[PDB]
Amino acid sequence: PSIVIASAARTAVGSFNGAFANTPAHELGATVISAVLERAGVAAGEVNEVILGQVLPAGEGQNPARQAAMKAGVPQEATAWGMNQLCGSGLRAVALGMQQIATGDASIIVAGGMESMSMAPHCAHLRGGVKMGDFKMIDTMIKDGLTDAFYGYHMGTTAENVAKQWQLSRDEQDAFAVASYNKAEAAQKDGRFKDEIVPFIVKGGDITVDADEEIRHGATLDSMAKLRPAFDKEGTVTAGNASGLNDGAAAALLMSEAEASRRGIQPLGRIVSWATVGVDPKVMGTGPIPASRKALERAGWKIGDLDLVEANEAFAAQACAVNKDLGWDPSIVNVNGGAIAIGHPIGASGARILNTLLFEMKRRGARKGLATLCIGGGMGVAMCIES
Amino acid sequence: PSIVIASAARTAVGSFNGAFANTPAHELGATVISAVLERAGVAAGEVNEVILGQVLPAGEGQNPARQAAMKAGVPQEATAWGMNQLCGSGLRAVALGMQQIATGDASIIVAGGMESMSMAPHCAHLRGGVKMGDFKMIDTMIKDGLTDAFYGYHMGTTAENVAKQWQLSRDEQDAFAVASYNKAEAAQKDGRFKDEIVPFIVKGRKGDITVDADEEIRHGATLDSMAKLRPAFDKEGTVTAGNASGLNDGAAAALLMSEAEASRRGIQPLGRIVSWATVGVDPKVMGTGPIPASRKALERAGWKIGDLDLVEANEAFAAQACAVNKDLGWDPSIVNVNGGAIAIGHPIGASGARILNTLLFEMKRRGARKGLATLCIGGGMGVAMCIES
Amino acid sequence: PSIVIASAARTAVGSFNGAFANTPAHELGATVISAVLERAGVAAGEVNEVILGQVLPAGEGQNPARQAAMKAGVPQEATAWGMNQLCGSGLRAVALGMQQIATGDASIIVAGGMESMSMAPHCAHLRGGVKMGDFKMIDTMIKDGLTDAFYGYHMGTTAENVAKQWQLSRDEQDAFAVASYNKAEAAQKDGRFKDEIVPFIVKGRKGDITVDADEEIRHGATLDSMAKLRPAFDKEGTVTAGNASGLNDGAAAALLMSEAEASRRGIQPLGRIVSWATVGVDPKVMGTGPIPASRKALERAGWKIGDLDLVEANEAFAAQACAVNKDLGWDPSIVNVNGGAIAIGHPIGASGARILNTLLFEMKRRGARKGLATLCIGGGMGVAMCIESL
Amino acid sequence: PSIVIASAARTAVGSFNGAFANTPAHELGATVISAVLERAGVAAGEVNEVILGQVLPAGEGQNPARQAAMKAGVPQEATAWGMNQLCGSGLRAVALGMQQIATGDASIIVAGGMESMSMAPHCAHLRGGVKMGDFKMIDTMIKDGLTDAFYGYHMGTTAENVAKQWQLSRDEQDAFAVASYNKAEAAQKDGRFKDEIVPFIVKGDITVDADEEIRHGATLDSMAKLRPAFDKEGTVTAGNASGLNDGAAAALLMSEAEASRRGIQPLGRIVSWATVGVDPKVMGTGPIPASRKALERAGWKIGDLDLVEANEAFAAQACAVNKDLGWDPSIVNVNGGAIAIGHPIGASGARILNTLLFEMKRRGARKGLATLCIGGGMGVAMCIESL
Ligand SMILES: CC(C)(COP(=O)(O)OP(=O)(O)OC[C@H]1O[C@@H](n2cnc3c(N)ncnc32)[C@H](O)[C@@H]1OP(=O)(O)O)[C@@H](O)C(=O)NCCC(=O)NCCS
Ligand SMILES: CC(C)(COP(=O)(O)OP(=O)(O)OC[C@H]1O[C@@H](n2cnc3c(N)ncnc32)[C@H](O)[C@@H]1OP(=O)(O)O)[C@@H](O)C(=O)NCCC(=O)NCCS
Ligand SMILES: CC(C)(COP(=O)(O)OP(=O)(O)OC[C@H]1O[C@@H](n2cnc3c(N)ncnc32)[C@H](O)[C@@H]1OP(=O)(O)O)[C@@H](O)C(=O)NCCC(=O)NCCS
Ligand SMILES: CC(C)(COP(=O)(O)OP(=O)(O)OC[C@H]1O[C@@H](n2cnc3c(N)ncnc32)[C@H](O)[C@@H]1OP(=O)(O)O)[C@@H](O)C(=O)NCCC(=O)NCCS
């Protein structure tokens, strides 16, 4: 039961109300679905199932994963469904597609994630009727994506809990963000994102989007320190050291190692192990810590065996706590930047960092890799990759 | 790897804006999660993951499956997530939880579905701003749950295509519906739903109300009143409110573990999962989805259609249900012996686990050895699972 | 010039989300407009202008007063318009229609008010767009009708201000409310509302329903159940849902013409408008508006308070109504003889003309010569009108 | 009783979602109320009543006329109320305030209109509850301000009916619109709007003292390239029709004897007024019978008029009005009209009264006439004589 990633692709990460301001998530998803089939030389008729993670599907219609699969050219014989583990949806969907082939219930799976947070609507329950008084139109992006359902405050407040408990100062979080911007800004000019990015044509004059628009040029430590806190009047999490609201999609083509050998495909890597563990919702940013340990234990690897690490940077506070506890070399963690600079599409972030992990391992010849993210509500997910 | 269903439970199916009119889906889910743990003698601290299918989670908060697990008593160390394959979500989640234990990544899984379509809100994209003119507040239940995203018409229109293609008259669909109502009315009086139903406490402010009976079951469904109804989707069609399933709320789940685990704990499971399958079809005739799904599930299990002792085929529409029983050709006396969704109700996210609950307890109640549960899915898909006692 | 009220009519006052839950205000207005023409023997083609007070017209369309006139049969040559002085709109519209005839710019006026508080929609400004976060859908009835724009609290809080300054206890307000219910229930049983009420046919989906009785009047209002209610505006206050007027729908109007015109047509008018007045007060105690308005009206008419034979003072709240009767000092036995808005209902835009209808028909049945109608107005205003019989 | 206009003032007319995009109507009204008081030397404590026409007050609060009076300094002893006769509201309020003094029920009146069409909200009746299906959020500006309640189509459709019956071609309407822009742009450059306009401070603070709808260099070629805005094969376009605008205007009314006792030189004497209704299909023909009734009530002939202000709701309705009555077009809208200046529904009636009054004093005209059309099939006119 050896499962490999034959190919992977992702769209550029768009800013909130930016290039993808009016593009539904399934429009970004099918472009990625068509890319992983074209990059692997596999026809759409051979896909058995499409598994796309999505957190904000309100208003898009019946099963947006089916719409993305039908629009990419996957025939009606295949099936499609969506799943939601918040920020780990994109990565958990890859593990779920791996289990479909491992149990012998499928041969070729397209798994990933898609998210259009700009298209997230405002909602309100109006069936019972409002007899008298004002009622609130709730932002589904904030309520169903960014607000803890057990304590009522934003994910940024949970990052404040991580910063206060781990004793991470404002200057330590800002320096981590600037380092993420500098690595991401360098990677874009050097063209290290060109392989993983598939261009998306926004048919409006038509506009082709093939570059992450969240990268701001010349991020200075001085401009980072002038920002006001966004969640606590005297807090430490700001707009600079926290991930933003973004749109995008990413996916991967899954098949057995024997199947890839029969088709002459050179896969990006083999999925050797995965894990998901839950933590206290107050400190949801610490999720990747027990998940990465469980994944490495299942793979038989030590922390020193890792050659490349992709840890999602939801917040600068949560990212500092993860790298210090596990103790892995920070020079191999997010070599090309993180979500603070690239963007954070919730449903697609799991597959987004998997794309960056896969293409960078082949680019520099890394043998062992690990991708992990934190999940709102107090959870984590991790996956071990071997080239 | 042999995976068994150690226990199962479901809430009563409530009417649209009825007893559960103001109850969130995760509150119905938490009751079922606690029930399957109590009925199997398994503590909440041993659950590894909770998998709940849900189609309409807008406005309920971050990951309602996590909320249902935390409120049911499952500790924070465990994980939870939701999935969406429309009407087959409740049953696919059970197959997904079965795969978690088969691959050795988990030991005990709570899988099922929950749906509160009464709590489904109206929405509208307003970030760009409406400079001038009227805009529509869209019903998320209709848009994301009941409308085909490729052709724009309701699921009832796909049933009209099935009825015309299979040449099913208005009288044949009404006769199937009346049979479904009468079987459900008999099952309710005989108490055949008491074992599977777990009572839900509607915690109100002017008195608590206990719900332990499906309120959609209509007493004395007559063929004359069935023929008096108007078509609901085509001005000259055949599908009416009587021969079609309704809008409902409810939750259902099952406790999954290996056969060795149940033997170590002295647990007597309700059944072993022998096979499952999911196939896609044309969205125009999505009601024919269960036909190739049942064929692949039986083919994967090594069974023939004649080997089945009990059959649970979800009755999304009377037209779609008649075409399935006619194609496969199994004995209709073993299909939905206690009624179907036409009489009980059709909570989209929870229907897959709902009919699995009725299949499991009825197989135990009458000593059936082999069973099959199957549903159709909007967009042109089907899902099926074969159960052996 | 001498302007008289040739005829008057009003619909039954409907409960909030009751019989008129889905009937637009102009549908109730058209019924009343047709009634005052039939009761006076005046054809619709003779009306020069229709003046209808309305406070909550959002969502009803372009100028609902014009819609009510066109549906009642008033030809397109005539004009129609709406005005808004809150709770005094129905009565101010009559004074405004009288001025149209006084200045010689019109001959026959249909003036009154209409209100459908059940049909008042929720609204929100969405042109700029909500980039991120929740926004509020505002109840237009609460915001534009029942909330003071200067202090932000409900009209019921202004009644609490009146109760504190006049030292009106909960027991006195409850006793005033129970007395209002018993007078209204007695008047309804005796049929004293039949003349003023015109039946309204609720064109529904499963058959037409005729409404000809005020449905807010509850039979057998007890002081014990009144005292068990909780305060509705202050957690430790005195104004409750029982001693305060409710949310209601309805319409009322009158046909105005000169005394010489009515004499030429052989019409016996209901009364002569002798004087009117409107004065403003502090918005904190808006319920005291009728005190300076009634005095200014009596001064303009040359009357003293003792000359009045009948008084119709709108009962917005039990606190404001008790403070008005104590200041002016008129005999309470001649004030609201058939009950008030606490029992009948308070459709804001139409209440001014509603109590004018009750004053006019009660003056004719008992032979009263001098009458006065007055109401309080949100924001700190009052309006009053003096009527003399013919 | 002879009633005069002691003073008049108006704000600059703002574009839809322009300088007044977030300014409530009563904020514009208070500025105008304070202006007419200062220009006449009359204190706010002397005002008896404020009468402001307003058509779209949804969401602004209880009686916006009272809010404008309280903020302008008018004491609580005075009264205030709003009225609604659509487009003729601003001018009818002046006639109503004139009647208050004629009957001896008031001495000093501030009458006019105010409108903030940008602040008009979307609404929907939700008390009964929407059990199932989609419902519409209704634009109160379109529904309660611009849509005929008897035939269901826009006011621009009624102008199409006017154009067909009088046989007014597209070229004639475009030439009328361009002429209106050129007259308004010339008057602005020469400063003929400076006297009537009171500057408004949009609280960086921004001072607005110029009508922002006036476009410099309006060409006939770009006018003819525009598409019809109400009928796919119609003749009314965005260029030959008035727009959606915000603004306020008012006037100070008192008896001629009162002004003489105060040493005030009035802008004019109100000699007559009239309002007549017409068929709602051709509501633009309202000024035709209304102006005749006003002239008949004043004892004047059409040839006696020295200056005319006829609101330009549409180029089609304005051409039909000038042709029927037959007055000299060289004395009609000498400084431009609503096609170039703007058309704030509640304030347009008083807006053209301001333009008529200051232009009559500027050139020494003795007799004037202001008139507008009203949705639903009505018209209003007023005759002014200088003193
Ligand atoms: C930033 C956030 C908190 C919302 O605040 P926001 O108003 O939308 O942020 P904006 O970009 O619109 O404005 C931020 C300001 O800081 C400035 N700024 C932001 N990042 C900066 C940087 N890195 N360097 C310098 N300046 C910066 C922006 O230009 C902007 O300027 P302004 O003061 O004129 O507005 C949003 O990113 C957020 O909600 N993040 C949560 C992500 C999350 O929780 N994901 C869940 C996974 S746990
Ligand atoms: C069919 C549907 C439109 C029904 O609409 P509905 O009008 O709200 O259904 P209701 O029962 O509330 O109203 C139906 C009317 O017929 C009556 N009626 C319905 N079923 C009846 C029956 N079986 N016997 C007798 N009378 C019946 C009802 O009492 C009601 O009375 P009314 O005429 O006074 O209104 C809706 O339930 C539906 O869309 N179902 C399919 C949803 C779906 O897609 N499910 C998943 C399949 S993929
Ligand atoms: C006072 C007010 C807030 C009440 O809100 P409400 O929810 O509609 O009050 P309700 O009538 O629906 O219910 C009140 C309760 O008291 C009871 N009650 C009301 N009046 C009663 C009476 N006269 N005697 C005995 N019991 C009474 C009702 O039955 C109800 O009990 P329930 O809830 O168990 O059924 C509302 O009527 C209001 O806003 N009034 C303002 C009037 C106003 O401002 N007018 C403008 C003039 S300035
Ligand atoms: C006609 C109306 C719909 C305007 O159309 P609109 O949707 O607002 O579109 P716009 O106003 O932004 O103008 C549209 C285009 O015409 C162009 N245009 C407008 N006026 C122009 C002019 N005078 N000369 C040349 N070009 C012009 C604009 O630049 C714009 O070009 P763009 O689309 O590339 O940005 C609106 O102004 C209206 O309804 N007016 C009627 C008001 C009314 O009836 N009041 C009641 C009277 S009784």
What's the CA gap between C371 and D207, in Å, rounded? 53
Q: How many beta carbons lie within 10 A of that of residue D279, not counting itself?
A: 14
Residue D239 CB less than 6 A away from ligand 4: yes
Tokens standing for B12? 């009563």
Those residues whose C-beta lies under 8 Å from the C-beta of residue A99, and which sit 6 or more positions away, are B99, B100, B102, B103, B105
CB C369 within 8 A of CB C308: no
Those residues whose C-beta lies under 8 Å from the C-beta of residue B189, and which sit 6 or more positions away, are none
What's the CA gap between D106 and A83, in Å, rounded? 72
> By CA distance, what is B155's nearest residue in A?
A62
Q: Is B180 helix (H, G, I), strand (E, B) or coil?
A: helix
Chains with at least 3 CB pairs less than 8 angstroms from chain C: A, B, D
Name the CA radius of gyration of chain C, rounded. Answer: 20
Q: In angstroms, what is the span from residue C53 Cα to ligand 3's centroid?
A: 25
- The count of residues in chain B is 389
Contact B128 C128 (CB under 8 A): no
Q: Which residue has the tokens 């190739």?
A: B292
Question: Degrees (nearest 5) of the Cα angle B30, B36, B41?
Answer: 125
What's the CA gap between B368 and D291, in Å, rounded? 92
What's the CA gap between D99 and C105, in Å, rounded? 10
Q: Is D224 helix (H, G, I), strand (E, B) or coil?
A: helix
D319 is a catalytic site residue: no
**Helix D315-325 crosses helix D170-189 at what angle (to 10 degrees)?**
90
In the 3-class helix/strand/coil scheme, how is chain A assigned residue by residue? CCEEEEEEEECCCEECCCCCCCCCHHHHHHHHHHHHHHHHCCCHHHCCEEEEECCCCCCCCCCHHHHHHHHHCCCCCCEEEEEECHHHHHHHHHHHHHHHHHCCCCCEEEEEEEEECCCCCEEECCCCCCCCCCEEEEEHHHHHHHECCCCCCEHHHHHHHHHHHHCCCHHHHHHHHHHHHHHHHHHHHCCCCCCCECCEEECCCCEEECCCCCCCCCCCHHHHHCCCECCCCCCCCECCCECCCEEEEEEEEEEEHHHHHHCCCCCCEEEEEEEEEECCHHHHHHCHHHHHHHHHHHHCCCHHHCCEEEECCCEHHHHHHHHHHHCCCHHHECCCCCHHHHCCCHHHHHHHHHHHHHHHHHHHCCCEEEEEEEECCCEEEEEEEEC
What's the CA gap between D97 and D49, in Å, rounded? 8
Taking the CA of D159 as reference, the closest ligand is: 4
List of domains in chain D: 270-385 (3.40.47.10)
What's the CA gap between A100 and C363, in Å, rounded? 88
DSSP state of C336: S
Burial B120-150 (b: 16+ CB within 10 A, else e): bbbbbbbbeebeeeeeebbbbbbbbbbbbbb
Q: How many beta carbons lie within 10 A of that of residue B236, not counting itself?
A: 6
CB A359 within 8 A of CB A5: no
Classify burial at B15, counting beta carbons within 10 Å of its beta carbon; exposed 0-12, middle 13-18, buried 19 or more: middle
Classify burial at C304, counting beta carbons within 10 Å of its beta carbon; exposed 0-12, middle 13-18, buried 19 or more: exposed
Total CB pairs under 8 A between chain A and C: 45
Those residues whose C-beta lies under 8 Å from the C-beta of residue A329, and which sit 6 or more positions away, are none
- The count of residues in chain D is 387
Classify strands A108-116 and A246-256 as parallel, antiparallel or unpaired.
Answer: antiparallel
DSSP state of B276: E
Nearest to C137 among A131, A132, A137 (CB): A137
Helix, strand, coil percent values for chain C (each to nearest 5): 40, 25, 35
- Helical segments of C219-344, H only: 223-227, 259-264, 290-301, 318-328, 341-344
Those residues whose C-beta lies under 8 Å from the C-beta of residue D205, and which sit 6 or more positions away, are none
Cα separations in angstroms, D310 against A36, B344, D343, D379: 67, 69, 12, 11
Classify burial at C132, counting beta carbons within 10 Å of its beta carbon; exposed 0-12, middle 13-18, buried 19 or more: middle
CB D75 within 8 A of CB D44: yes
- The count of residues in chain A is 387
What's the CA gap between C44 and C110, in Å, rounded? 10
DSSP state of B291: H
Q: Return the half-sphere exposure (C-beta side, CA atoms, 13 A cut-off) of residue A196.
A: 30
Q: In angstroms, what is the span from residue D165 Cα to ligand 2's centroid?
A: 51
CB B262 within 8 A of CB B194: no
What's the CA gap between B318 and B296, in Å, rounded? 23
Catalytic residue numbers of C, as ranges? 87, 346, 376
What's the CA gap between D108 and D117, in Å, rounded? 29
B123 is a catalytic site residue: no
Burial A20-59 (b: 16+ CB within 10 A, else e): bbebbbbbbbbbbbbbbbbbbebebebbbbbbbbbbbbbb
What is the sign, positive or negative, of the torsion defined by CA atoms of B280, B281, B282, B285? Answer: negative
> By CA distance, what is C152's nearest residue in D?
D61
Q: Which ligand 3 atom is at minimum distance from the Cα of C246?
A: 37
> DSSP of D324-375, one letter per residue?
HH---GGGBSTT--HHHH---HHHHHHHHHHHHHHHHHHHT-SEEEEEEEET
Beta-bridge partners for B109 = B49, B256
Contact A142 C130 (CB under 8 A): no
Helix, strand, coil percent values for chain D (each to nearest 5): 40, 25, 35
CB D235 within 8 A of CB D317: no
Cα separations in angstroms, D180 against A83, D313, D343, D372, D379: 61, 12, 13, 16, 21
Q: Is B190 helix (H, G, I), strand (E, B) or coil?
A: coil
Task: Kindly provide the residue ranges of all beta strands, DSSP E only, lying in chain C, ordered along the sequence.
Answer: 3-10, 14-15, 49-53, 79-84, 108-116, 122-124, 135-139, 200-202, 209-211, 248-258, 271-280, 310-313, 370-377, 381-388
Q: Which residue has the tokens 């249902």?
A: B68
What's the CA gap between B192 and B181, in Å, rounded? 15
After which residues do gaps appear in chain A, with C to N over 2.5 Å?
204
Classify burial at D303, counting beta carbons within 10 Å of its beta carbon; exposed 0-12, middle 13-18, buried 19 or more: exposed
Beta-bridge partners for D314 = D241
What's the CA gap between D189 and D169, in Å, rounded? 31
What's the CA gap between D158 and D281, in Å, rounded? 6
Amino acid code (one letter) for C104: G
Q: How many beta carbons lie within 10 A of that of residue A339, not counting itself?
A: 28
Those residues whose C-beta lies under 8 Å from the C-beta of residue B254, and which sit 6 or more positions away, are B5, B7, B8, B9, B36, B94, B110, B111, B112, B270, B353, B356, B357, B360
Q: Is D190 helix (H, G, I), strand (E, B) or coil?
A: coil
DSSP state of C143: I
CB A20 within 8 A of CB B107: no
Both ends of chain A: CA-CA distance in Å? 16
Task: Kindly provide the residue ranges of all beta strands, DSSP E only, lying in D14-107, ordered along the sequence.
Answer: 14-15, 49-53, 79-84
Residue B254's H or E segment, with its range, is: strand B248-258
Contact C137 A131 (CB under 8 A): no
Task: Kindly provide the residue ranges of all beta strands, DSSP E only, lying in D72-218, ordered along the sequence.
Answer: 79-84, 108-116, 122-124, 135-139, 200-202, 206-208
Distance from CA of A315 to the nearest CA of B (A): 18
A374 is a catalytic site residue: yes
What's the CA gap between A353 and D102, in Å, rounded? 80
Q: Which residue has the tokens 């007319």?
A: D13
Residues B87, B154, B322, B386: which is the catalytic one? B87
**Helix A155-166 crosses helix A316-326 at what angle (to 10 degrees)?**
40
What's the CA gap between D309 and D382, in Å, rounded? 10
Tokens standing for C324? 């008005």
What's the CA gap between B93 and B254, in Å, rounded? 10
Beta-bridge partners for B123 = A123, B138
CB C133 within 8 A of CB C71: no
Torsion-angle region of A373 (φ positive above 0: left; ψ -120 to 50: alpha; else: beta): beta
Nearest to C142 among A124, A133, A137 (CB): A133
Ligand 1 neighbours, Cβ below 6 Å, are: A 87, 146, 155-156, 219, 223-224, 227, 230, 239-240, 242-245, 314, 344, 376; C 132
In angstroms, how far is CA A362 from the centroid of its own chain? Answer: 20
CB A125 within 8 A of CB B139: no
What's the CA gap between A243 and A241, in Å, rounded? 7
What's the CA gap between B305 and B334, in Å, rounded? 12
Chains with at least 3 CB pairs less than 8 angstroms from chain B: A, C, D
For residue D129, the chain A residues in CB contact (below 8 A) are 126-130
Both ends of chain D: CA-CA distance in Å? 15
> DSSP of D78-97, one letter per residue?
SEEEEEE-GGGHHHHHHHHH
**Helix A316-326 crosses helix A170-189 at what angle (to 10 degrees)?**
90
CB D56 within 8 A of CB D113: no
What is the sign, positive or negative, of the torsion defined by CA atoms of C21, C26, C32, C38? Answer: negative
Q: How many beta carbons lie within 10 A of that of residue C201, not counting itself?
A: 13
Distance from CA of D178 to the nearest CA of B (A): 26
Q: Which ligand 2 atom is at minimum distance from the Cα of B221?
A: 24
In angstroms, how far is CA D28 from the centroid of its own chain? Answer: 14
Contact C136 A138 (CB under 8 A): no
Classify strands D108-116 and D49-53 as parallel, antiparallel or unpaired.
Answer: parallel
CB D298 within 8 A of CB D305: no
Q: How many beta carbons lie within 10 A of that of residue C326, not counting itself?
A: 12
Residue C316 CB less than 6 A away from ligand 3: yes
Q: Which residue has the tokens 């013919």?
A: C390
Q: How many beta carbons lie within 10 A of that of residue B75, not counting itself?
A: 13
> DSSP of C10-64, one letter per residue?
EPPPEETTSTTTT--HHHHHHHHHHHHHHHHT--GGG--EEEEE-S--TTS-S-H
For residue B129, the chain C residues in CB contact (below 8 A) are 126-130
